Amino acid sequence: QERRTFGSYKIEELTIKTKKIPLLDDGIFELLNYLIDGTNFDKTCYCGFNYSHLPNLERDFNVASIYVRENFELCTENLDLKDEKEENSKPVTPKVVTPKEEKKTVEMSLLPILNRESEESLSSEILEGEAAVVNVFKMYIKGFLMYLGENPNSYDRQLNIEKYRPLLISIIGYEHLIGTRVPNKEVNHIFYQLATFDNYPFDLLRFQLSSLISTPALIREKIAKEGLFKIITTVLFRGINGSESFLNIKRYRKFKTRIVGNVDCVIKSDFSSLKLD
Amino acid sequence: ERRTFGSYKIEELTIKNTKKIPLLDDGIFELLNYLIDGTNFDKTCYCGFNYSHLPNLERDFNVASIYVRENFELCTENLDLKDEKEENSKPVTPKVVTPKEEKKTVEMSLLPILNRLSSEILEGEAAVVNVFKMYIKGFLMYLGENPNSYDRQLNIEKYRPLLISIIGYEHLIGTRVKEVNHIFYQLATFDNYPFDLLRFQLSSLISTPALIREKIAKEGLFKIITTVLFRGINGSESFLNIKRYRKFKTRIVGNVDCVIKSDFSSLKLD
Amino acid sequence: QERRTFGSYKIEELTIKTKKIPLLDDGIFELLNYLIDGTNFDKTCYCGFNYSHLPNLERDFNVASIYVRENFELCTENLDLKDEKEENSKPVTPKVVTPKEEKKTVEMSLLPILNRESEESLSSEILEGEAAVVNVFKMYIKGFLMYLGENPNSYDRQLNIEKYRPLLISIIGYEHLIGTRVPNKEVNHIFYQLATFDNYPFDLLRFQLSSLISTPALIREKIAKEGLFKIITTVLFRGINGSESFLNIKRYRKFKTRIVGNVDCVIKSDFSSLKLD
Amino acid sequence: ERRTFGSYKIEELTIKNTKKIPLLDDGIFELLNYLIDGTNFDKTCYCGFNYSHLPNLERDFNVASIYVRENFELCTENLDLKDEKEENSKPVTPKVVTPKEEKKTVEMSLLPILNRLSSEILEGEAAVVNVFKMYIKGFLMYLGENPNSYDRQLNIEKYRPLLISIIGYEHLIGTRVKEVNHIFYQLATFDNYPFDLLRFQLSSLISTPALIREKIAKEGLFKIITTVLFRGINGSESFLNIKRYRKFKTRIVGNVDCVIKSDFSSLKLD
Amino acid sequence: QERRTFGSYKIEELTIKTKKIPLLDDGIFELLNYLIDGTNFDKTCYCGFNYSHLPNLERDFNVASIYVRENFELCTENLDLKDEKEENSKPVTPKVVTPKEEKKTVEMSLLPILNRESEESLSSEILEGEAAVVNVFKMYIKGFLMYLGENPNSYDRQLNIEKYRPLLISIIGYEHLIGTRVPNKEVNHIFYQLATFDNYPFDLLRFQLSSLISTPALIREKIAKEGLFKIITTVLFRGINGSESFLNIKRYRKFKTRIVGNVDCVIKSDFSSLKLD
Amino acid sequence: ERRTFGSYKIEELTIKNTKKIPLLDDGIFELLNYLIDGTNFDKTCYCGFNYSHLPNLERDFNVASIYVRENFELCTENLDLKDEKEENSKPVTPKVVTPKEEKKTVEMSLLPILNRLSSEILEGEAAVVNVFKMYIKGFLMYLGENPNSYDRQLNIEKYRPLLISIIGYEHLIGTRVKEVNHIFYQLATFDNYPFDLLRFQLSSLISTPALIREKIAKEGLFKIITTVLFRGINGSESFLNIKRYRKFKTRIVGNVDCVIKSDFSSLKLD
Amino acid sequence: QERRTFGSYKIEELTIKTKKIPLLDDGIFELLNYLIDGTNFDKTCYCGFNYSHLPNLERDFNVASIYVRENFELCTENLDLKDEKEENSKPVTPKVVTPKEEKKTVEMSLLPILNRESEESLSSEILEGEAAVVNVFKMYIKGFLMYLGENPNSYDRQLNIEKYRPLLISIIGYEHLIGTRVPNKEVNHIFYQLATFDNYPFDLLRFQLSSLISTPALIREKIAKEGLFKIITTVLFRGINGSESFLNIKRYRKFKTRIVGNVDCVIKSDFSSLKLD
């Protein structure tokens, strides 16, 4: 695999009886994987692009990376190593990832600050790592938006943002918290919209993005008087349209070369000179 | 859009996860279709390429095209008309094509001179024979220059009929008015030649065995039996299969080349 | 089962709605099995044929047999016996065979000299056993070639050499090694070709075999400046056409009589004499 | 190629791994076909074998063939022609064959003398009856000499109609102008006779029960009811099934008998 | 279940899209089951019929029953009880039955005297039990024959004796042994025939039974010079036609009432008197 | 063979191991068929039973039969003939039967007097109405006397049309020339009545609700809407289904009643 | 879930290619569940309706509830807790319920007094709990009857009482016992009928209920001279028509909201004012 700009997606043309199309990146699983691996930024595909209308992606990434990776180790300490299959899942809001390691299931929650039953943050190192991941989420979303807006593709009509929802959700949940209980801001209308309508198709998004409507007054009222989430027994998301949507668990896989052979060094022959009449 | 005469396109299919591979061109059905349509060369994809180590493809094509098309009309005259579903078949040797017209089956045989008297006809025939040789050579030249990971899984089976005609004709105009060409003869004999091995082994291959030339004179390239058998170049007698040519068009699509782009850096996400 | 000449194949006509055709020998699985069994040559089907344009098959076989069998024992010593289902597999190049014994998987690699991670040969007894198996491989290939060339069959058109690849691969890999680091020779063009094109159909092989083209100069250059194998993470094979092909794992089974009854001793009756009019 | 009159061929089928077994000849469909085709005996596979403990098979065959074929023509006269798909059926007793002509169904009954006046007709009938007896006897003689592991799974069911006709006829020309033959009668009664047990038990089997001969006179070999019932030899009344005869040709093949052989010892592999 | 005569079968009409037909008795499984259960004769369905052209069935049965049952106990002693699903199988010749008891497989061989690898009889009690079971086999066969001959059924044409083979086989195997090595007799042609042709259909059997052909001289020669069985690695049976047939393993099940309700006590009403016009 | 008018036969089907149960008679299709065939009563299975608490079934049947058959002929006159596949359907109320003739669909309506002028016609109609009442009563009487374990799974649904006609007619000849019969009315209203509960509850059931008689006068037994709706007896308005009647014959069989028996005690087995 | 009257059912319209219809309540599983949970009446949906032509439902329920729940605990004491999937079954007569708790099967029988092999009641507390559950059964049946009679539904024609059988069966079994061996009464004809014909469809029931026939004399005779149950090896039920019916095991499940989202707070917009022409 080679250079890719942070947030960018690749669309692959599939052919079956029709032409389907995997969105596979959605560079999302790759991203999480990097984070858990603790890998440094300059060790990732994202290395050395324009950068940026994304101020200091590298640092925030590196922080978020160390934090996430530490979290991993701290989850796996009390448990065996014995020397893992790659698919993730993200219950939300906490954005708890859920790997599985060739038998044993592992579960770790970044942004636990977005929990009720948990809270008890309380380390400032932790708080710093969390704000870093939230930051890199916003930069991912923005990578994707910027790249969409500049790279129309015939499949846009069949594609939506569903698989980005968790990041967005976290991004707004966090924005709410650090907003209610510290600097004043209201949650960001763009992320809020993309989070509310995850069915936004690519083309219509590119067209309608700029700008979209500001949060309805009534919805801000309901946002204060109650929360962005109704916790019920599973969690519900509110607005921006006043809808209450169950937050799905999303699963991230990826695949690769898988056995790929090489025809490019193969001697080429000139067939004209041969006289067949 | 533009395609060079004889060239093939390989399409990657995906089904489990496997990846199968249609050879669909094999630009063959397209070619026949053009011919029946009577279409002029400059009206075809093949228009305006290097051209050539293929001297005067355009003329011979145009001739062969008018000839074929005339044949069609002369087959359909005594019969009803239409305002037709596209698949062909080629019994061989005569290289009789067999379309079907949304009910009614039609059947017309180019190169009827081959087994089973106008000089205009002779001219059209020698033209189609020519364009066959040029198609084969297009394909050969393009293979030799365009290696593809799937070559290992691909063979020449679907080219057999043209090759067969090309040699059958060569034999006729040879016996009563040269020996048949060893390359075409080989590709005609071994239709299972896989692409890669072909590119590698093509140059050159062995000359026709003496014994096989003897048997080629003392008897023919074809044993007609009741269905037809082909002989050599290895001394094999192979039944000549009926081959079927279809094509499809991924449902006719749109272009995004013209869609408004937006600069998304400007807006405030933090 | 009865007499068969070394390298020879048998083709069986199958009937299903069409007539398919098993190549089942491919006497290959049988061969390996013999080798692991340590069986002596005069105890095998191959016993007592013309023999030969294959000088001293018997000795080299017997050596290769003792060597292989010893290898087996040495693999199974540190492990249980407790008193096996017959199918093999051959990752290559090392030509490591992989049996399974009614529960427990066993894995043993002849020609380990064809390994990087292994090397450390180092016994000359071993070296002798290895050169013996490589020898019997070349004699198997040649058995098959000679027998093909003399025994045309209507199915030749549908048959290829795919299942012989591993032996050939080993045969050339070895030829390379003992070539680079001892007597001068270049790897043998025939084996090299059959190894490169495993899709060679029987008929075209018989016809085209004699002779085929000598290794391209450029390919010999690339063969020195780099190797016959690109090791990547699985192994890639090079040329003779400049192709880089992934080496498949191949599986060898065989079946037999399975319940077969006997009609040949059954009393025969003469029905003409009876007068029915 | 060559086959002796009455002989069967057993083909080993493979499906799971099981091995099933088509009896396909049962050279019966082939036989009927010949007859309708009017083909002469020396033009058939049966040509030039030992022949015979079957005195003058050729003549009787040729007669029965001309007769049958004439019957066909006389059925198809009043009806349209063609330039036909091959499967037959035989309601019995009359042994009416039932072909189908690529649309139109045709139906013609040999041995119409059997239930449901030309002496030429009588002659043709007695000829087909004869060749039936010779077919059965071909089959019997060949079974008895050619044991096959599948005999245990095979029976005579598909021979029933000929046998039935053979006895029905025997009865007629017997009552009004001998008692019906116990062998044919037995094989006709028990169509489930497996090959092996048949070879073993054939010689001889029991003579018709007296009581059954009484019931055979006082009533007939057939109870016609509304479809027809057969009687004895055991006192059973069995509905006579319609039987269907098809055949196929493993797709017409090639020969390698003539392909150049190479001496491969010569070359250097080490 | 109620009264049934020893050897008798019942045919059941099945309906599916056609009418199939189970032969289910074949009272064979029931019989074995009785024997293993050790049940006394007067405790079985067979109790109190004409009896007989079968002299002293009751005693021989009772003996064979005690013997079989003892055998069972002696097989199960060294093993657990812990307090069984009903299906049997009969490898032959030994006529070893093979139950399974809700987990654990059990295997017991009556007529072990019909073994090579076993032999070592040697108790006369055993010999007595064995000759008893062989006797009751002959009486079963004869029950079935007699009952067939008197009870024609439209399905006879579709039915054969396949499922009786093992008893017959044992019956002749035994007859051979006690014949070669004690009183002179040749094996019984009827049992021998039914054993050779297990495909004998019911109707043709009834018709052809009386009598059938005597053993071919050549077959008696081959029967002395070699045996009724070729043991090969599974066993082969010989003649009476000179055929060598693999002896199949046969499986005996049965089913019953399974939930059956009762309409026969249900009050019946007279509907004419009611005036509907 | 012999069956009493109105009687049903239950057949045990076996599929998993379950045991399903065809009610196939429901001798209804058979009955209709007879009627169209015009067959005389003494030519039918129903011939020669106790008969009766059903006064003069034979006459009324014969009348209804001639009438129906005449109707058939009068429907088929203006149309082509044949030398027909057997399934019927009955839209209701008119009780129009709908056969199909191996291509051509035919449709004929007995009791046309019912919704949608010859006295011969009136007579035939009143005859079919009569035989319907006698069929229902046959079935009732036979149920009440013949309990079967499957009664619990069986209902009267397939009788509905006759019952419906029987009441519709009763209403007509009642309004313009008695109140409709409560039993038939009930069975017509609840077609889901299972056999067992029917036998138990039949005697007697409740008399028509007053309110329902009021609604029966002030409006009708049928709301015709665009398909027809039935009313009461419970105040339900039920769409009247089209019902389809088929029958099959386990492939026509043989008898063993006559097959020679052998005394097998005699022979020596030991 | 919200208010429901004791015994009432709800019918749900299903759509598949047709419209099927679940009877799911049948509030029966819910009821049992409550009882095992030991829940008090005022804590159940049934709370605060008309109540009643059902005198003192609340008390009898509460008693029956405590009794059942105690029974549960007493079944689970000798066994593990370790901290359950909701489906029940009811063999009858005893009306033994059969839960399963995420691995381990549990089985508890209310109305054990309706057993032979058990009997040995003998506590009067128990007797009191039992008569309470029997009472609440009769009140459930009557809830359902009353509610049916007043709430016609187009599906009535396709619905029967099959799933109520066990309660009814218990209700009559009990009535018999406490009848034979204490106050004189004959078993109640209505329950007896509904118990005998479980195929009674809803509509015909509503119509025919009032009244139905009194128990046939002959059936009362057979009811004394033998019992309501023939115990056979599974149990058979008798009459009221003289039928002997096997009593089925019945299984009670229920499902719910399962992920349900909320559109009702979602901002509504007025589209007329916008001028599109």
Contact A37, A47 (CB under 8 A): no
**D239 near F CB under 8 A:** yes
Contact A25, A254 (CB under 8 A): yes
Put simply, the answer to whether A266 touches C219 (Cβ < 8 Å) is: no
C71 CA: distance to closest CA in chain E (Å):
29
Q: Identify all chain A residues contacting C236, using CB atoms and an 8 Å cutoff.
A: 261-262
Q: Identify all chain D residues contacting F251, using CB atoms and an 8 Å cutoff.
A: 239
AA identity, residue A81: L
B97 CA: distance to closest CA in chain C (Å):
26
Contact C142, C54 (CB under 8 A): yes
Instruction: Select from G200, G203, G245 the Cβ nearest to the Cβ of F234.
Output: G203
Put simply, the answer to whether A269 touches B144 (Cβ < 8 Å) is: yes
DSSP E strands in chain F: the ranges are 8-9, 25-26, 87-90, 96-97, 108-109, 222-224, 228-231, 237-239, 243-246
Helix (H) or strand (E) holding G236: strand G235-238
- Return the structure tokens found at D223: 């109870």
Put simply, the answer to whether G199 touches F194 (Cβ < 8 Å) is: yes
What's the DSSP call for residue F168?
H
What's the DSSP call for residue F42?
G
DSSP E strands in chain E: the ranges are 9-10, 25-26, 87-90, 96-97, 100-101, 104-105, 108-109, 229-231, 235-238, 244-246, 250-253
Gap between the Cα atoms of C226 and C205, Å rounded: 29
A272 CA: distance to closest CA in chain C (Å):
20
CA dihedral G44→G46→G49→G51, nearest 10 degrees, is -110
Name the experiment that determined this structure. X-ray
**All residues at 6 or more sequence positions from C119 whose CB lies less than 8 Å from its CB, including other chains:** C113
What is the DSSP code string of D208-250?
Answer: PPHHHHHHHHHS-SEEE---EEEE-SSS-EEEPPPEEEE---S
User: What are φ and ψ of residue G131, in 5° steps?
Assistant: -60, -30
User: What are φ and ψ of residue A77, in 5° steps?
Assistant: -65, -60
Q: Identify all chain A residues contacting G267, using CB atoms and an 8 Å cutoff.
A: 216, 218-219, 241-242
* CA distances in angstroms from E45 to A109, B215, E42, E252, F53, listed in the order given: 72, 83, 8, 18, 46
Helix axis angle, F119-145 relative to F182-189, nearest 10°?
Answer: 80
Q: Identify all chain D residues contacting E206, using CB atoms and an 8 Å cutoff.
A: 234
Put simply, the answer to whether F252 touches D209 (Cβ < 8 Å) is: no
Q: In the 3-class helix/strand/coil scheme, how is C179-248 assigned residue by residue? A: HHCCCCCCCCHHHHHHHHCCCCEHHHHHHHCCCCCCCCHHHHHHHHHCCCEEECCCEEEECCCCCEEECC
Instruction: Select from B190, B197, B200 the Cβ nearest to the Cβ of C203.
Output: B190
**F117 near D CB under 8 A:** no
Put simply, the answer to whether A243 touches G259 (Cβ < 8 Å) is: no
**D209 near F CB under 8 A:** yes
**All residues at 6 or more sequence positions from E52 whose CB lies less than 8 Å from its CB, including other chains:** none
Q: Identify all chain F residues contacting G206, using CB atoms and an 8 Å cutoff.
A: 234
Q: Identify all chain C residues contacting D184, using CB atoms and an 8 Å cutoff.
A: 276
Instruction: Select from F141, F262, F268 the Cβ nearest to the Cβ of E209.
Output: F262
Contact A26, A163 (CB under 8 A): yes
**G220 near E CB under 8 A:** no
Gap between the Cα atoms of F47 and F49, Å rounded: 6
**G249 near E CB under 8 A:** no
DSSP E strands in chain B: the ranges are 8-9, 25-26, 87-90, 96-97, 108-109, 222-224, 228-231, 237-239, 243-246
Put simply, the answer to whether A219 touches G266 (Cβ < 8 Å) is: no
Cis-peptide into A93, omega within 30 deg: yes
**F55 near D CB under 8 A:** no
User: What are φ and ψ of residue B167, in 5° steps?
Assistant: -80, -40
Gap between the Cα atoms of G133 and G121, Å rounded: 15
Cβ contacts of E171-174, under 8 Å, gap ≥ 24: E171/E134, E171/E137, E171/E138, E171/E141, E171/E195, E172/E228, E173/E93, E173/E111, E173/E114, E173/E228, E173/E229, E174/E111, E174/E113, E174/E114, E174/E130, E174/E131, E174/E134
Gap between the Cα atoms of D195 and D39, Å rounded: 31
Which SS3 state, helix, strand or coil, does residue G244 take? strand
Q: Identify all chain D residues contacting B239, using CB atoms and an 8 Å cutoff.
A: 251-254
**D253 near B CB under 8 A:** yes
Instruction: Select from A234, A244, A246 the Cβ nearest to the Cβ of G265.
Output: A244
**G260 near A CB under 8 A:** yes
- Return the structure tokens found at B46: 């093949």
Contact F221, F240 (CB under 8 A): no
Helix (H) or strand (E) holding D188: helix D182-189
Burial per residue of G164-203, b for 16 or more beta-carbon CB atoms within 10 angstroms, e otherwise: bbbbbbbbbbbbbbbeeeeeeeebbebbbbbbbbbbbbbb
Gap between the Cα atoms of E97 and E71, Å rounded: 11
- The structure was resolved to a resolution in Å of 3.0
E 122-151 → D contacts, CB under 8 A: none
Query: Tokens 């009004």 label which residue?
Result: D176
What is the DSSP code string of chain A?
Answer: -----TT-EE-----SSS------EETHHHHHHHHHHT--GGGSTTTTS---SSTTHHHHHHHHHHHHHHHHHHHHTTS-------EEEE-TTTTEE--EETTEE--EES-GGG-SSS-----HHHHHHHHHHHHHHHHHHHHHHHHHHH---TTGGG-BSGGGHHHHHHHHHHHHHHHHTSS-PPPPHHHHHHHH-TT-BHHHHHHH-SS-PPPPHHHHHHHHHS-SEEE---EEEE-SSS-EEEPPPEEEE----SS--B-TTSPP---TTS---
Tally of CB atoms within 10 A around F265: 14
Put simply, the answer to whether E246 touches C260 (Cβ < 8 Å) is: yes
* Longest pairwise C-alpha distance within chain G: 88
Gap between the Cα atoms of B189 and D84, Å rounded: 34
Cis-peptide into G26, omega within 30 deg: yes
Gap between the Cα atoms of A126 and A119, Å rounded: 12
- Return the structure tokens found at A218: 């009534």
**All residues at 6 or more sequence positions from A204 whose CB lies less than 8 Å from its CB, including other chains:** none
User: What are φ and ψ of residue C193, in 5° steps?
Assistant: -65, -55
B78 CA: distance to closest CA in chain A (Å):
38
Contact C90, C166 (CB under 8 A): yes
Nearest residue on chain C to D149, alpha-carbon basis? C263
* CA distances in angstroms from C213 to B250, C139, C173, listed in the order given: 42, 22, 20
* CA distances in angstroms from B23 to A259, B155, B162, B163, listed in the order given: 22, 9, 17, 18
Query: Which of B79, B129, B125, B124 has the alpha carbon at shortest distance from B105?
Result: B79
**Chains in contact with chain A (at least 3 beta-carbon pairs closer than 8 A):** B, C, G
Gap between the Cα atoms of F49 and F3, Å rounded: 8
- Return the structure tokens found at F24: 């196939």
**C15 near D CB under 8 A:** yes
**All residues at 6 or more sequence positions from C241 whose CB lies less than 8 Å from its CB, including other chains:** A266, A267, B196, B199, B200, C196, C197, C216, C219
Q: Identify all chain G residues contacting E260, using CB atoms and an 8 Å cutoff.
A: 246
Nearest residue on chain B to D256, alpha-carbon basis? B236
Gap between the Cα atoms of C233 and B249, Å rounded: 39
Q: Which of D234, D237, D240 to mutate to test the interface with E (most CBs of E within 10 A)?
A: D234
Contact G212, F197 (CB under 8 A): no
Put simply, the answer to whether E268 touches F145 (Cβ < 8 Å) is: yes
Which SS3 state, helix, strand or coil, does residue G48 take? coil
**A153 near G CB under 8 A:** no
Q: Identify all chain C residues contacting E238, using CB atoms and an 8 Å cutoff.
A: 265
Gap between the Cα atoms of G205 and G153, Å rounded: 13
**All residues at 6 or more sequence positions from E244 whose CB lies less than 8 Å from its CB, including other chains:** C261, C262, C263, C265, E230, E236, E237, E238
- Return the structure tokens found at F47: 């011939």
Instruction: Select from B147, B199, B236 the Cβ nearest to the Cβ of C203.
Output: B236
Q: Which of B190, B192, B204 to mutate to test the interface with C (most CBs of C within 10 A)?
A: B192
Q: Estimate the share of chain D in helix, then strand, then coil, as percent rounded to the nearest 5.
A: 40, 10, 50
What is the rounded end-to-end Cα distance, in angstroms, of chain A? Answer: 47
Nearest residue on chain A to G259, alpha-carbon basis? A246
Tally of CB atoms within 10 A around D190: 25
